[model samples]
Target chain A: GVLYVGSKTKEGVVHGVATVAEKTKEQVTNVGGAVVTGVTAVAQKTVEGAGSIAAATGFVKKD
Target chain B: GVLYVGSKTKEGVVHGVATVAEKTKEQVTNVGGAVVTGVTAVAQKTVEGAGSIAAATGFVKKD
Candidate 1:
């Protein structure tokens, strides 16, 4: 049998230094259905052949 | 969220015991695309709508 191995994967569309990191020393957390982390802003270049871009808005993924 | 585990998979269209199974003793090779034994002589009824069949001609997959 021939085995197919992948070597190169297309780069992700989004790239940047994370700007926020939050934490609570002690708290009882109860999360429910979809919780969203808003991507308030992004500065990226439309590089040729850099792959596709996608976004999740309230549980719906869109490109 | 639901946890799903696959236990059974539909069989491939072609069914045959390979007449020729080859392996090299000392070498590196890429045994290309799927290789199916000639199936030129075999008989097994395609019992009712069980699944589908596909064929590839000259590197092109056709259903």
Candidate 2:
């Protein structure tokens, strides 16, 4: 998912960003997905549960 | 190491309006997730952090 986000800059490549969000266990189980309290993501990196290839995007700094 | 984004309808059959923008902190690592100020998304994109994959259209609309 594309919920929570963070950033990591290594060498010349910035690891997009990370994200997180809350979901109830019931909801997660209903959809057959895990109910993680908080979730995170880096733009181009495919999420673990996502299990799919996603198009990438550039991130903007908060400050 | 990463943050946020949003969505598709089902089986790549549809796409959402747009990704506006993009988390979190050391508070328990805030794994409970990020808090983006203003976020808007279609049914498909709303649950970007949600772990479920079944009942894909069951989204709770805001306003």
Candidate 3:
């Protein structure tokens, strides 16, 4: 196993002064139905669990 | 929003058998209870959904 010890990671948080952050579009396999269908499945379940408010608003996440 | 169109991505798939990857341990947000509990939750549900026989084996996943 190759371990990538990251150094370019967000600078040591001197109190959140700065920060930082992939995508595998469709290469994912049957790792699990969760990550497979991913946003599709959870999107519905997530929206459903939300108080019908987030169900229709931008009180949401990044795309 | 910033888009990182990478060419370094596992060169255009000429088919299976190539690779790639990143990680952000403990830096997750409460976007949803799903991605939150994440592996813990689904892992249980996933492994649980398998045949009861799987209740004691390696028909499992990565950590």
**Against the true structure, what is each candidate's TM-score?**
0.13, 0.14, 0.14
| Chain B TM-scores across candidates | 0.18, 0.14, 0.13
Clashes of each: 0, 22, 0
Taking all chains together, the TM-score of candidate 1 against the true structure is: 0.13
Per-model CA lDDT versus the true structure: 0.22, 0.24, 0.21
User: Sorted on DockQ, highest at the top, how do the candidates line up?
Assistant: 2, 3, 1
Better of 1 and 2 by DockQ: 2
Q: Whole-model lDDT for model 3 versus the true structure?
A: 0.21
Compose the digit string of candidate 3's lDDT tens values, residues A7-62.
22222211101123333322221111222121111122322221322111122223
Which digits, one per residue and each the tens of the lDDT, describe model 1 over residues A1-63?
Answer: 222222221321322212221242322211211111211221122222423222111221132
What is the RMSD, in Å, between candidate 3 and the native fold over all Cα? 20.6
Candidate 2 vs candidate 3, DockQ winner: 2
Candidate 2 local lDDT, A1-63, one digit each (tens) = 444433232222112124333432211111112222111222221133544322212222234
Error of 3 at A11 (Å): 27
Clashing pairs in 1: none
**What's the residue-level lDDT of B3 in candidate 2?**
35
Q: Please give the TM-score that candidate 3 achieves against the real structure.
A: 0.14
